[PDB]
């Protein structure tokens, strides 16, 4: 599924979106429509998706030695995640 | 009836310049009768320290904005100069006051109950 | 409001760096069904991590070294304590009450 | 509707249908009452509610007449006030003379409204004496005096048609009427200590309570009840350092006024069985060792074993505080390992609800609206003993409407009508798509009720991918106003340890022989793997098996002594309040992870509650808003619900069986608490024993 | 021995001796409360390093005393009235049912009263 | 009101500084607030009705 089995560096991704809201729209498309793909290449890595009100887009990825990688997606297109998300490896 | 030694009238003042030359003027009082505040209260120490620790108390105050607050930390600043000169305070307190004195590590707060 | 009148309240520095208030309006006691003492606004402060209370050792009377235990403000409306608050630089957390939700309450209403 | 009338010049405008006196108490105007409650159906007999109306000669029981258009309402009339002060002359006609000795002495209604609207003095020196009654004992809960009963029927009402409990009656004839049982027998109700509450005169008081303390004395503190995962508003009130009594307190949209018999009366366990000092295993048996030693000892023992990456295993109790359980995942991922996960029995290694989104594990129709919802489904799950006070609401649902309630599992004495289904999978398989599965889809708001002991069992993912799928292919049970799926949980660290992702997902992992295994609050570990080469550590607030089993024990600090969050079942994010200090030199539960990082060279970043409370924002940014549901939007709840969907999965046909064998034993201060003993030898396990053996 | 000395219980075990100091009172051994603190407990301090403990406070305890007296037999009537035998110095009027077999204590003074009918079943 | 009652500081003598000195409040009792058992329900009504009969504005009587 593209390139989405990620190193044994990444060990969860965590998603953050407002339930509604423009800018949380793209991110909220992405997970909806590619996420079972991701899962379904990734059973050992845990990926969570947490809501907040009023908040803008964000995604954290956890390397080794328990450090978090945060990647703001804030304007960032259904597509264009893609590459983020890769750009963490 | 008349006031006591030292005295001043407490007035409110509204201009942020004429505060300053209040406050200058006040802090020289300090200094100049700071042989007399050793000798009168029997201080341990040299007067320079007196006119050393003096001077760092006038800064604490320095950067407020608000005119309403200029004036009362003035009022009181008047007010305790006042009781140093007359000897009305005692010995035991002028002492405390100039006898004041890195934080610990987590472990070191934490192994002896922190706050 | 605006200005920093903590400093001239003469208060000790560690109500603004060291403790915690909290600004809430009381419950109604389950036990009694009164509803007066749940009409003031009242500010307290947060308990000490350690020091708070301690078994003296002689008489077992409960000694503390903190000196807002017994301290409880009260007011009448809800601003004019979070402005009290603000004045004096106060690290307050609010608590909002909360409201019982209303239902209509018929005797006949056993049968039917 | 509303109808537009005056109570002594004030304006009401209430619904049409309300009575007189919920007019006069939005008007502000303050009507006596003693057999009204707002939570109880309504009687009529102590009339003290007495008001004037206009047209009639008749004084009204506001709290039973209904309100009218333009009807004018008189409460301070000369009249009114000599009706009120002859009602207070007849209630304390055969009251004893007890307030000296009875428990209600500063709190007691009879006490204040008499005080505020009877007469000063009494016109009572008959020389035959007042009406004396037996007390009789209903069990070791409630200690009855009923020379106190006003006869208000509050505690008849209350376990009739909210507990549940048809065994409370007025037994007798005008005045020999004698409140109680009729027969001696103990009243078995998860919820009969809530009686305790309503009665306003010292008639039905706390029996471990009994003669401790007076009101006045003690500090009330608003915190949450975590014996159970619902969360419970309830008020602990402390004097000094104890903490004397638990009570509810008013929130309508968890408990409702109410709080269960294990919640109000498990508050003696936190004298008990306490850890106070830091204990370090040598040979057989313990020796006290100061913050100093056992410290160093953690460190020195973590690197004579060296556990590898994934060879440290961290274990998370029920009562875990969400504080404490990231800064244990943040230290344990410090130190390179994932195998984190807590001390139940789910079998499947990724739970069956996962923790990848947040609609799969909660209670996503919150409960606020379980009244309003048409059909229920219960799916092996046991709610008189895993949410007490949840069952009562759907009890109260069920008996003002036609609310019809199916439950699918091991069947069970309940306190409302059933109607049964099966005992495994495939009764839930043919269920849904029968009979039943058509009621939930031409309802509007069906709900479909998941236990949490659901997930204890072999068909664990068969359920969540049966039901999901019924789910999945629904219009009525997902829509943008309604979530009709629900999981209900019992241990009060499940939702938030699943919002953190306190949680592992790999198979592997989860069966790595760990050597250095850091015990978190957990107590139940029996099933758990624990080799004898394995060097534990127990970080907890009283000894049990969690305890036992480590090589250094870390104190800990109980709900009632830290500051704290947890999140309950529904999502609602709730945090406690520190009532009291924590005894001896106990610590703050993720205070010592923070200690323990700079012993083992992994120094975690924070430094303060402000700090860690920083942290929540950062794992998930809804940790962060107190009482505040972020409930999950519709189309992103419908990506989850379909990931539970698993073809080629088999039915083993296990029996749904509740995971709740002992209602008063399930934490560790009800295990330790002696007032839960005499429950257990009076009652049971199920609360089902109707004689109390244990009399004296 | 410290077993008795330091758990309360209903009634004692052995008999009790005036001279005993570590008595929790001099007519009674073990204390009589849940929280009491034993006395023995409470005399190993450093402060009674030098005292005579013989010349401290013991009151009898009086737990042990209103158990010696006789019980109250009310004759053709269930309920008993006790008013502390002394009216105004007494304690406050205080009705007891006794319709139950066996001996209701009354509230404030600790007299115990039944009925004489059932008198027999009580002294067994 | 916010100054508590019993003050921030307290004072003892200094064997070490043969003076007596300024120590931070620490009571061996602490104060016990019995002032949280109040009254729950109000106690004394809305008064009655003194004004002077010629300080009340008139109220404009009906028409015919
Ligand atoms: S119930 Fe109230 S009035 Fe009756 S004895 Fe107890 S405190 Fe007094
Ligand atoms: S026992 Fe209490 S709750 Fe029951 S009727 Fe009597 S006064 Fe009311
Ligand atoms: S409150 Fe209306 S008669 Fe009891
Ligand atoms: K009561
Ligand atoms: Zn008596």
Redesign the pocket.
Same mark, same amino acid.
């Given at each position: 599924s593209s390139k989405f089995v990620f190193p044994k560096v990444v060990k969860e991704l965590r998603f953050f979106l407002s339930q509604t809201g423009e800018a949380s729209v793209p991110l909220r498309s992405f997970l909806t429509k590619t996420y079972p793909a991701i899962k379904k290449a990734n059973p050992t890595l845990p990926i969570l998706i947490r809501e907040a009100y009023g908040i803008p887009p964000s995604v954290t990825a956890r390397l080794e030695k328990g450090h978090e990688v945060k990647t703001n997606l804030e304007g960032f297109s259904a597509d264009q995640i893609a590459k983020t998300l890769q750009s963490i490896a | 009836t008349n006031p006591t030694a030292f005295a001043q009238t407490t007035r409110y003042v509204k201009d942020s310049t004429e505060m300053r030359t209040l406050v200058l003027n006040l802090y020289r009082r300090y200094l100049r009768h700071s042989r007399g505040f050793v000798n009168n209260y029997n201080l341990d120490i040299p007067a320079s320290q007196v006119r050393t620790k003096i001077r760092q108390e006038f800064e604490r105050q320095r950067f407020v904005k608000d005119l309403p607050l200029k004036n009362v930390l003035y009022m009181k600043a008047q007010m305790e100069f006042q009781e140093l000169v007359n000897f009305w305070k005692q010995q035991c307190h002028v002492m405390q006051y100039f006898e004041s004195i890195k934080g610990d590590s987590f472990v070191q707060k934490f192994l002896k109950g922190a706050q | 409001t605006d200005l920093a009148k903590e400093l001239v309240s003469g208060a000790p520095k560690e109500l603004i760096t060291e403790r915690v208030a909290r600004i809430y309006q009381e419950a109604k006691a389950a036990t009694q069904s009164g509803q007066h003492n749940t009409e003031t606004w009242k500010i307290d402060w947060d308990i000490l991590n350690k020091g708070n209370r301690w078994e003296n050792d002689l008489m077992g009377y409960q000694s503390s070294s903190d000196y807002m235990q017994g301290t409880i403000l009260k007011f009448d409306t809800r601003e004019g304590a979070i402005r009290f608050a603000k004045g004096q630089g106060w690290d307050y957390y609010i608590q909002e009450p909360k409201v019982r939700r209303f239902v209509k309450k018929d005797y006949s209403a056993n049968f039917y | 509707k509303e109808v537009e009338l005056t109570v002594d010049g004030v304006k009401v405008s209430i619904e049409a249908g309300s009575s007189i006196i919920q007019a006069a108490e939005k008007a502000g105007v303050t009507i006596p009452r003693?057999?009204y409650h707002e939570k109880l159906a309504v009687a009529g007999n102590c009339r003290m509610c007495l008001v004037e109306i206009e047209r009639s000669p008749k004084l009204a029981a506001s709290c039973a007449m209904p309100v009218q258009n333009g009807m004018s309402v008189l409460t301070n009339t000369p009249k009114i006030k000599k009706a009120r002060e002859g009602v207070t002359e007849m209630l304390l006609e055969n009251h004893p003379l007890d307030c000296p000795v009875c428990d209600q002495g500063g709190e007691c209604d009879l006490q204040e409204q008499s005080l505020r609207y009877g007469s000063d003095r009494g016109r009572f020196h008959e020389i035959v004496g007042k009406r004396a009654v037996e007390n009789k004992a209903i069990g070791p809960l409630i200690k009855t005096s009923?020379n +106190?009963? *006003?006869?208000?029927? +509050?505690? !008849?009402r209350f376990l009739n048609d909210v507990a549940g409990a048809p065994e409370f009656g007025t037994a007798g004839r005008g005045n020999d009427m004698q *409140?109680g049982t009729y027969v001696e027998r103990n009243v078995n109700s998860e919820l009969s200590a809530n !009686?305790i509450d309503?009665?306003? !005169?010292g008639?039905?008081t706390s029996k471990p309570y009994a003669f401790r303390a007076r009101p006045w004395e003690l500090k009330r503190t608003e915190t949450i009840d975590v014996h159970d995962a619902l969360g419970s508003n309830v008020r602990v009130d402390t004097r000094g350092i104890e903490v004397m009594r638990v009570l509810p307190r008013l929130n309508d949209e968890i408990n409702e006024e109410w709080i269960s018999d294990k919640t109000r009366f498990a508050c003696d366990g936190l004298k008990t069985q306490r850890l106070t000092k830091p204990l370090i295993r040598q040979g057989n048996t313990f020796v006290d060792a100061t913050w100093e030693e056992a410290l160093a000892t953690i460190a020195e023992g973590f690197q004579k074993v060296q556990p590898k990456e994934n060879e440290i295993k961290a274990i998370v109790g029920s009562l875990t505080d969400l504080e404490s359980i990231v800064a244990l995942k943040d230290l344990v991922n410090k130190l390179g390992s994932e195998n984190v996960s807590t001390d139940g029995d789910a079998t499947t290694v990724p739970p069956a609800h996962g923790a990848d989104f947040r609609s799969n594990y909660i209670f996503n129709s919150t409960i606020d609206n379980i009244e309003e919802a048409d059909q229920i489904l219960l799916v092996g799950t046991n709610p008189r003993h895993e949410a007490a006070v949840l069952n009562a609401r759907i009890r109260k649902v069920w008996l003002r409407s036609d609310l019809e309630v199916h439950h699918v599992g091991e069947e069970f004495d309940s306190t409302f009508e059933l109607n049964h289904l099966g005992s495994d999978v495939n009764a839930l398989a043919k269920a849904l798509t029968g009979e039943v599965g058509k009621k939930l889809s031409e309802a509007s708001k069906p709900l479909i009720i998941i236990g949490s002991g659901v997930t204890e069992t072999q068909d664990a993912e068969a359920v969540y991918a049966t039901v999901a799928k019924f789910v999945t292919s629904n219009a009525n049970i997902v829509t943008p106003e309604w979530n009709g799926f629900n999981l209900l949980h019992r241990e009060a660290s499940r939702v938030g340890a699943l919002d953190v992702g306190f949680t592992t997902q790999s198979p592997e992992v989860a069966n790595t022989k760990a050597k250095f295994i850091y015990l978190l609050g957990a107590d139940e570990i029996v099933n758990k793997d624990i080799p004898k080469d394995a060097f534990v550590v127990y970080q907890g607030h009283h000894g049990d098996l969690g305890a036992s089993f480590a090589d250094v024990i870390l104190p800990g600090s109980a709900y009632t002594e830290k500051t704290a969050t947890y999140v309950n079942t529904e999502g609602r994010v709730q945090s406690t309040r520190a009532a009291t200090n924590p005894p001896g030199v106990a610590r703050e539960d993720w205070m010592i992870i923070r200690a323990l990082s700079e012993y083992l060279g992994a120094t975690l970043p924070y430094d303060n509650l402000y700090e860690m409370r920083s942290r929540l924002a950062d794992v998930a940014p809804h940790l962060l808003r107190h009482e505040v549901v972020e409930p999950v939007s519709e189309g992103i709840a419908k990506v989850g619900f379909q990931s539970l969907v698993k073809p080629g999965i088999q039915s083993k046909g296990v029996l749904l069986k509740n995971p709740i064998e002992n209602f008063y034993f399930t934490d560790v201060i009800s295990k330790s608490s002696p007032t839960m003993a005499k429950c257990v030898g009076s009652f049971g396990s199920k609360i089902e024993k109707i004689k109390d053996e244990k009399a004296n | 021995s410290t077993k008795e000395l330091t758990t309360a219980r209903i009634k004692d075990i052995s008999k009790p001796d005036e001279n005993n100091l570590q008595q929790q009172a001099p007519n009674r051994i073990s204390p009589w409360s849940k929280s009491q603190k034993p006395r023995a407990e409470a005399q190993d301090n450093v402060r009674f390093a030098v005292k005579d403990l013989a010349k401290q406070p013991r009151p009898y305890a009086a737990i042990d005393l209103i158990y010696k007296q006789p019980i109250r037999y009310i004759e053709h009537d269930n309920v008993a009235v006790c008013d502390g035998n002394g009216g105004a110095q007494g304690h406050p009027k205080v009705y007891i049912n006794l319709d139950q077999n066996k001996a209701i204590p009354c509230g404030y003074c600790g007299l115990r009263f039944a009925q004489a009918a059932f008198k027999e079943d009580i002294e067994s | 009101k916010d100054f508590p009652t019993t003050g921030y500081t307290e004072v003892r003598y200094d064997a070490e500084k043969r003076r007596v000195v300024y120590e931070p409040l620490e009571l061996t009792q602490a104060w016990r607030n019995f002032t949280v058992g109040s009254s729950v329900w109000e106690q004394v009504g809305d008064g009655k009705d003194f004004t002077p009969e010629s300080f009340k504005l008139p109220t404009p009587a009906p028409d015919p």
């Open positions: - | - | - | 003693y057999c009923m +106190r009963c *006003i006869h208000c029927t +509050r505690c !008849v *409140i !009686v309503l009665c306003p !005169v008639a039905l | - | -």
